[PDB]
Design a binder for this molecule. Structure first.
Ligand SMILES: N#Cc1ccc(CNC(=O)N2CCOCC2)cc1
Ligand SMILES: [Cl-]
Ligand SMILES: [Cl-]
Ligand SMILES: [Cl-]
Ligand SMILES: [Cl-]
Ligand SMILES: [Cl-]
Ligand SMILES: [Mg+2]
Length: 345
């Protein structure tokens, strides 16, 4: 059952992989990635070698979390796991983990910069994001990091969600795309967040497809909040009650009150149905945002919506997230998941 492995050094890194993977070529702090040709399937693939996967309890649990998530995701608009392997022949010598996925070409940033998008293109792209999100949310998973660089798109306009949130303070500081798509309640730690944060990100992405430009390109956290409240209005008393951070509540009330703007005068010339959907996604109070399942039934997607072809996920057991274990116990759980992997049909 065990394949033969061969070794090579790629940029000061020793890679040991099954013979089926050929022509390894580096492409890019949690791991290094190589493109390769998989001779068993004929696919160009990405092979990721995890860096120090078991160096601490936090790292070991993150390794297990990533492998559990990738093994569960089986949907047309979500990245799936093609293979996982280790050169180790036993738990006692187990140290390295390699993950194999489909090699992705362009992302949605490349699309918005270099392509003139019709309203039909916007409909199809956002429809596919929402179809994948309905599946992800049905398993009680929150992506947390939806942005154009985490959305792969091919020549047929077909889309896949990748790079689930599994981010440092410095990574979120300043004029950075890593913060421009985040919901205000998570950007500013207003309250315990939930899956509705992902719908805010979809609204930001859809706006950028319609205009070609970032919706909220803030130069820091506070500048970005000011841009958001200018468009959607300052909070009312109902939402202020739900901000459990007393310090954040007090800062918000320092700001002069502003009404919600007219979205037809912001998104000039857009399909009126697109404007309506944006008003339902970009709602400050997360309790009142439209959900992915509700949005698929909005009239903007009438030509693509098929309620018999929008599937949900198998149940996903996340009880490990509240479990406290030692490094070697997380490592043993990960080893079990590596050796039990069953490849897709
Ligand atoms: N380590 C581990 C571990 C692996 C599988 C299970 C349950 N079985 C399962 O999910 N599959 C789906 C794929 O086909 C076979 C059955 C439990 C623990
Ligand atoms: Cl092989
Ligand atoms: Cl895939
Ligand atoms: Cl190993
Ligand atoms: Cl991005
Ligand atoms: Cl499960
Ligand atoms: Mg990414």
């Amino acid at each position: 059952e065990r394949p033969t492995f061969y070794r090579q050094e790629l940029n000061k890194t020793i890679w040991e992989v099954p013979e089926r993977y050929q022509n390894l070529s580096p492409v890019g702090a949690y791991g290094s990635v190589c493109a390769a040709f998989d001779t068993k399937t004929g696919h160009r693939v990405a092979v990721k070698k995890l860096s120090r996967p078991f160096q601490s309890i936090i790292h070991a649990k993150r390794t297990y979390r990533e492998l559990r998530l990738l093994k569960h995701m089986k949907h047309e608009n979500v990245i799936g796991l093609l293979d996982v392997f280790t050169p180790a022949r036993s738990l006692e010598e187990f140290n390295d983990v390699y993950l194999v996925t489909h090699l992705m070409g362009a992302d949605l940033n490349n699309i918005v910069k270099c392509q003139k998008l019709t309203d039909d293109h916007v409909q199809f792209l956002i429809y596919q994001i929402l179809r994948g999100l309905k599946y992800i949310h049905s398993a009680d998973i929150i992506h947390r990091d939806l942005k154009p660089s985490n959305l792969a798109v091919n020549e047929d306009c077909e889309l896949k969600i990748l790079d689930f949130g599994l981010h440092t303070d410095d990574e979120m500081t300043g004029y950075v795309a890593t913060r421009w798509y985040r919901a205000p309640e998570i950007m500013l730690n207003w309250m315990h967040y939930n899956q509705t944060v992902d719908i805010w990100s979809v609204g930001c992405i859809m706006a950028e497809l319609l205009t070609g430009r970032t919706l909220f390109p803030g130069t820091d956290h506070i500048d970005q909040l000011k841009l958001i409240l200018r468009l959607v209005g300052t909070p009312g008393a109902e939402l202020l009650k739900k901000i459990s951070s007393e310090s954040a509540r007090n800062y918000i009330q320092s700001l002069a009150q502003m009404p919600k703007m007219n979205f037809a005068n912001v998104f000039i010339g857009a399909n009126p149905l697109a404007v309506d959907l944006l008003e339902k996604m970009l709602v400050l109070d997360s309790d009142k945002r439209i959900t992915a399942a509700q949005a698929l039934a909005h009239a903007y997607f009438a030509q693509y919506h098929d309620p018999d072809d929008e599937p949900v996920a198998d149940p996903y057991d996340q009880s490990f997230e509240s479990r406290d274990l030692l490094i070697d116990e997380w490592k043993s759980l990960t080893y079990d998941e590596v050796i039990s992997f069953v490849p897709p049909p």
